[PDB]
């Protein structure tokens, strides 16, 4: 029993964290084989922040203006490329603690663990979702830049996010490990707008199934609903559209509880109409959208 926002064991990633310094600027880098990936804004001074020309800033740097530091050891830089918004420093030593890994670009709604770090030193680990507006609600102070997000699946670490910057709202923006930003953001200190955020409908439905599996049926009712009629009520609450794809995905969790997806859509409709009236579901006084169908299947037993 029990349900808890559970991050992956941070061990395989801690072994890849390094410190990258460029003049006075210092943030975190990921060290995999002989390469160190980090946000390219390491090469910006306080003046360059507003309208930086990265190619011009970078053609002015040699390898020896990049101090990579793996704990106590200094690492020797022997090459520097730039891919999109990440700097790729080549180093003389391949990371002995390189895990089995791939790079993946996740979609909005999907969850990852974050390993928050300061000076190539890990401080904490927590679970996040890519919001529909492409931001993440993270915990990140100054120096946390280049902290990475990841899933682990069978000893294979899937790096999906690198932290670049905080927005005036207090939410967080970053790139995939190929340096392509998530959302319409750029590594510039120009005012950029955090798009209007929605609740991830499919993740709430999964988390209701999770409550049924942990022995709570109190929120259910005898109604059904057409996919369309739900979405028309859903969107009135700033809930993301539910697609036929979201429905197919929830099939396994519907089957294991014998509550068809659109019955569960009705339970939610009513939950939105009413609130909780002093009850809680899985320990929460509002509806949690940061648990995916996959997440629920893993954490929750086959026994209902």
Ligand X SMILES: C=CC(=O)O[C@H](CC)C(=O)NCCc1c[nH]c2ccccc12
The catalytic residues are 41, 145
Cα dihedral value 67, 105, 132, 172, nearest 10:
0
Q: Which uninterrupted H or E stretch holds 22?
A: strand 17-22
CB of 278 vs a copy of itself, minimal distance in Å:
10
* Cα angle value 3/5/7 (rounded, 5°): 125
The residue within the footprint of ligand X, chosen from 12, 40, 131, 163 (CB under 6 A), is 163
CB of 246 to a copy of itself, least distance (A): 23
Q: Which does 298 bind (CB under 5 to 8 A by kind): a copy of itself, ligand X, none?
A: a copy of itself
Q: Do residues 106 and 112 lie in contact, with contact meaning Cβ atoms separated by under 8 Å?
A: yes
Least separation in angstroms between CB 83 and a copy of itself: 27
d(CA 131, CA 64): 39
CB 225 within 8 A of CB 262: yes
Least separation in angstroms between residue 16's CB and a copy of itself is: 11
Stretch that binds ligand X, among 11-19, 41-49, 63-71, 152-160 (CB under 6 A): 41-49
Judged by beta carbon distances under 5 to 8 A according to partner kind, the member of ligand X, a copy of itself, none in contact with residue 187 is ligand X
CB of 217 to a copy of itself, least distance (A): 14
Residue 27 or 208: which CB sits closer to ligand X?
A: 27
Q: What's the gap between Cα 44 and its chain centre?
A: 25
**If we measure between CA atoms, which residue out of 230, 227, 212 comes closest to residue 270?**
230
Complex with a copy of itself: residue 113 or 231, whichever CB lies closer? 113
The entry of a copy of itself, ligand X, none that residue 189 binds, CB within 5 to 8 Å by partner kind: ligand X
Give the C-alpha separation, 171 to 189, whole Å.
15
CB neighbours of 90 closer than 8 A, spacing ≥ 6? 34, 35, 77, 78, 79, 80, 81
- Contact characters 121-140, ligand X, x per CB under 6 A: -------------------x
**Judged by CB, which is closer to a copy of itself: 137, or 217?**
137
Find out whether 189 and 145 touch, Cβ atoms under 8 Å: no
Q: Does 12 bind ligand X (CB under 6 A)?
A: no
The pairing of strands 100-103 and 156-166 is parallel
Site for ligand X, residues 174 to 233, rule: CB under 6 A: 187, 189
27 binds, options a copy of itself, ligand X, none, Cβ within 5 to 8 A by partner type: ligand X
Q: Under rule CB under 6 A, how many of the chain's residues touch ligand X?
A: 15
Residue that is written with structure tokens 């000076």 in the block: 119
Element (H, E) at 234: helix 227-234
Binding site for ligand X (CB under 6 A): 1, 27, 41, 44, 49, 140, 142-145, 163, 165-166, 187, 189
């Amino acid at each position: 029993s029990g349900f808890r926002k559970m991050a992956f064991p941070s061990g395989k990633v801690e072994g890849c964290m390094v410190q990258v310094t460029c003049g006075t600027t210092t943030l975190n880098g990921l060290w995999l084989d002989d390469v160190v990936y980090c946000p390219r804004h390491v090469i910006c001074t306080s003046e360059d922040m507003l309208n930086p020309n990265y190619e011009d800033l970078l053609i002015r740097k040699s390898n020896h203006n990049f101090l990579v530091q793996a704990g106590n050891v200094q690492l020797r830089v022997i090459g520097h490329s730039m891919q999109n918004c990440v700097l790729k420093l080549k180093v003389d030593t391949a990371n002995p603690k390189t895990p089995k890994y791939k790079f993946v670009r996740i979609q909005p709604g999907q969850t990852f663990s974050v390993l928050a770090c300061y000076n190539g030193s890990p401080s904490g680990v927590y679970q996040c979702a890519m919001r529909p507006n492409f931001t993440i609600k993270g915990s990140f102070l100054n120096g946390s830049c280049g902290s990475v997000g990841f899933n682990i699946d069978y000893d294979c670490v899937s790096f999906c996010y690198m932290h670049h910057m905080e927005l005036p709202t207090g939410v967080h923006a970053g790139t995939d490990l190929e340096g392509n930003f998530y959302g319409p953001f750029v590594d510039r200190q120009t005012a950029q707008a955090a798009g209007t955020d929605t609740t991830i409908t499919v993740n709430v439905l999964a988390w209701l199934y999770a409550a049924v599996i942990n022995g709570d049926r109190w929120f259910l009712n005898r109604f059904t609903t057409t996919l369309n009629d739900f979405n028309l009520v859903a969107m009135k609450y700033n809930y993301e559209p539910l697609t036929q794809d979201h429905v197919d995905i929830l099939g396994p969790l519907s089957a294991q509880t014998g509550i068809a997806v659109l019955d569960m859509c009705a339970s939610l409709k009513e939950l939105l109409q009413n609130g909780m009236n002093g009850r809680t579901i899985l320990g929460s006084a509002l509806l949690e959208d940061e648990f995916t169908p996959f997440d629920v299947v893993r954490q929750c037993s086959g026994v209902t």
